[PDB]
Write a protein that binds this ligand. Structure first.
Ligand SMILES: Nc1ncnc2c1ncn2[C@@H]1O[C@H](COP(=O)(O)CP(=O)(O)OP(=O)(O)O)[C@@H](O)[C@H]1O
Ligand SMILES: Nc1ncnc2c1ncn2[C@@H]1O[C@H](COP(=O)(O)CP(=O)(O)OP(=O)(O)O)[C@@H](O)[C@H]1O
Ligand SMILES: [Mg+2]
Ligand SMILES: [Mg+2]
Lengths: 322, 322
């Protein structure tokens, strides 16, 4: 553990950049609570112009050891700088949403609907293609050679988003626990009608994450709905609120299945309510998406907020091609 | 040409013209089914061809319209006890066969499971074949060229009957409103998860039948469950209780869809609880099944009880082939 850090620091001296980067990663793979590695890797990353990652490391170091002097002097400088960097990116997104606020766009909107389904289902392991999804939703006929469950995941999504767009989007008032159960009722209804629209009865594992016990789900969902209809959350930038709402639901994991799908849809509800286009996390982005969700469980929700913001920009860029 | 047909039918009956009179009598009742004089005349005519059961139905129909019609009374006062004994004897013939039914049989039981689904779905209009149903339930893969809704009807049935057999069949105690909503939850869950497991909110028409208003469904369902757990129903022969339970549910029509399917399964619940094999109303029997259900709405539940009893015998006969 300490052997790797002393080796990484020596490699950093005079040359050997990629030899040190993998050595630093090794010392943190050995022990991610290595206060000395975190600050060293943080100071190292700041040299390659990555202040955001550096600050993450100094921050991770401080939660472990609050009076570590090297982490403090560094963090006392990055904290305000990183907050401005984040705030600037949000203004860049706002300028693009101002541009999107004003036949070619209609052809993009209809295909991105079928596309959103493709990615939201594929990210969970759905082997279906975009042409098969486009067929299933248009003919209502079964795609030959593919399982019923996979095609029922697709119908379920469609029923969920047609529900949000007709009932929920434009609706005035506070978001309730019944609304979330109603989205889940459609998401999972064609795959598991017994568990669709109802709270988890058993205890589950999501990677290395153990969600609240089924006995406490109802209470934690009550607090979450209350936070959605609170003014602290209402004061956040739309992208930050939408990412936090998504993380919090996913964290509670109130359902046996369809947590990620319901969250991604609740995220789009938050966005669209504040006049933002619906957003799509791609099949290819899965590995990064699970990495940033892990980083939030560990204590820092910021990388996930930036991930959701990179997605909002890539969705706003794709629309501005026409 | 109402009384004109009856006077013509009676003349045709004199000396000869049997089939000319039978269609003439049917015409007079197609013109007016509340023709007290046609009903008694057709009743006296049918008794000549050895059909006492149909005759009694007619004399009974005549008496509900006109209670003091002398010709209908003298005839009914003779058929009522005779027809009750005829019915009671058929029930004893069924009991003797259930006593007989109490590797070759195992091969019949497994195929009749897939068969029961084929008929219960086809009777509602499902274009799927027995080989396609056998595929869907074994591979869980979609049948090419057929709609998703039709295959989801099949999965739904299977979930419903696996539920009844594991939870409900052997269960000791009273049958509740929650049990019926739980069967419906599976029956219709893969086709309409929003309406599956819940009572009708709108008013519907079933042929010429207008079921109770959605406001009264809950009260009528409360009375029905109470009748299932009552001792008057408990004193009836198993076949008569199972047929009455099926008619009463179907009459209330508490669901937008899957009433016939839930009833047919509740019927099998009643039968199996009293040690009878599960019963199958065939695709081909549809026209007779809807005829006898109409006859009950009109005031006489007996033809439907005999229909369900003919089904129980044909199911007991098929088992005794091995
Ligand atoms: N490390 C982690 N900690 C917490 N939540 C995580 C996580 N990694 C993934 N998740 C979330 O949990 C979802 C996967 O959870 P699972 O229990 O595997 C099935 P699921 O709820 O059916 O998700 P789905 O709707 O994407 O299919 C992801 O889509 C994501 O939103
Ligand atoms: N004249 C009648 N009066 C009352 N019920 C009748 C009837 N004719 C038919 N039925 C019952 O009502 C069912 C058909 O009702 P519908 O409203 O058409 C659709 P359903 O409930 O989805 O039936 P399903 O499960 O057979 O598909 C029949 O299967 C039968 O059990
Ligand atoms: Mg899943
Ligand atoms: Mg039908």
């Amino acid at each position: 553990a300490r052997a790797a850090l002393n080796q990484a620091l020596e490699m950093k001296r005079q040359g050997k950049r990629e030899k040190a980067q993998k050595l630093f990663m090794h010392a943190l793979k050995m022990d991610p609570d290595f206060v000395d590695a975190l600050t060293e890797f943080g100071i190292f990353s700041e040299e390659d112009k990555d202040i955001i990652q550096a600050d993450y490391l100094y921050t991770r170091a401080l939660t472990i050891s609050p009076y570590h002097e090297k982490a403090l002097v560094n963090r006392d400088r990055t904290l305000p700088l990183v907050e401005e960097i984040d705030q600037r990116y949000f203004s860049i997104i706002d300028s693009k949403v101002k541009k999107v606020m004003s036949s070619a766009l209609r052809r993009v909107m209809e295909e991105t609907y079928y596309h959103h389904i493709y990615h939201t289902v594929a990210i969970e392991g759905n082997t279906l293609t975009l042409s098969e999804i486009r067929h299933i939703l248009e003919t209502r006929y079964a795609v030959p050679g593919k399982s019923l469950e996979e095609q029922n995941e697709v119908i379920g999504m469609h029923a969920a988003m047609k529900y949000i767009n007709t009932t929920l989007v434009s609706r005035i008032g506070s978001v309730t626990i019944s609304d979330v159960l109603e989205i889940h009722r459609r998401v999972l209804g064609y795959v598991d009608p017994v568990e669709a629209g109802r709270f988890r009865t058993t205890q589950v594992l999501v990677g290395h994450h153990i969600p609240p016990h089924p006995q406490d789900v109802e209470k934690q969902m009550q607090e979450f709905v209350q936070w959605l209809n609170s003014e602290e959350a209402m004061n956040l930038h739309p992208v930050e609120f939408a990412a936090l709402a998504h993380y919090k639901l996913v964290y509670i994991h109130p359902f046996i299945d369809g947590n990620g799908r319901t969250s991604r849809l609740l995220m789009n509800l938050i966005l669209m309510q504040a006049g933002y286009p619906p957003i799509t996390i791609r099949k290819e982005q899965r590995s990064d998406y699970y990495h940033v969700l892990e980083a939030a469980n560990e204590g820092d929700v910021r990388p996930f907020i930036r991930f959701i913001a990179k997605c909002t920009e890539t969705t706003l860029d794709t629309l501005l091609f026409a």
